[PDB]
Amino acid sequence: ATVTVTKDDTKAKEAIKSWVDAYNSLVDTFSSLTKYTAVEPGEEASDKNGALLGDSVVRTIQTGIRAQFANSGSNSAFKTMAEIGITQDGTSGKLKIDDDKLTKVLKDNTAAARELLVGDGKETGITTKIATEVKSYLADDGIIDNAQDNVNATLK
């Protein structure tokens, strides 16, 4: 009676799509919160504009997340998301995946992707750095909370 053991990429790909979708939703939220709209000369901005139009916190967060993509020091052979079949659009800023290329690399060099995405978990790992920054933002002192405390000023 025979037994077989192979490799499981399903769970991984599976997992990755959720992260990409979450990031895309976040970008959508940015766009909605700072929706621009031109107006006639001589008249102040239109009401329909996003409530955060002209704010710098949104830019701060959006920029801060991105640079975490370019992880530093990771021993993983790959150094970029394209190498693992994930690309970012230069006009919309959203993330897309070449699913079959992802599958191929999964079967080929899963270890390099392991190192690149997380690795040791101390400093290596785009997710590691991103988690650091996201926690920093969400903190009580985090930019959003200190801006929501200058907006607890806008309130109190």
């Binding site: 621009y36 031109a38 107006v39 000369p41 102040e44 150094k79 970029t80 230069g90 006009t91």
Partner: protein, 148 residues
Amino acid sequence: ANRFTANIKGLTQASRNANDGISIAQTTEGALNEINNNLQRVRELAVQSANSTNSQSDLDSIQAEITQRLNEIDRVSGQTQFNGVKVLAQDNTLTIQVGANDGETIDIDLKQINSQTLGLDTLNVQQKYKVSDTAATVTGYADTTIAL
């Protein structure tokens, strides 16, 4: 009362001038955000090129999208305008009156942001091919329209 009325009307007109100024600034931001996104895609593709094992054909293919994005930057830069003002046209300064007397303005600075000014027009990542030159297997014959 005359002084008060003069100040009132002047301040109203200043308010509308401020309307225009804020609008132009917001449009400038709107353009700059997309410009920045494009540049970030460009950096992604460059670090993708950083894969030393890739072929020169792959390098050329990547350079294709690099050129596409550069042309897109030029398009957007030449496109964006406000009330007949090409916002990114050239290194320029605008003074907007917001007071009620002479020389009472807010100053704004604008730049000729484009592929050329940023200096990324000439950027490239390709590697020169090895080319062997020979008469090659030119089968058949040439039957040119000779001037007999």
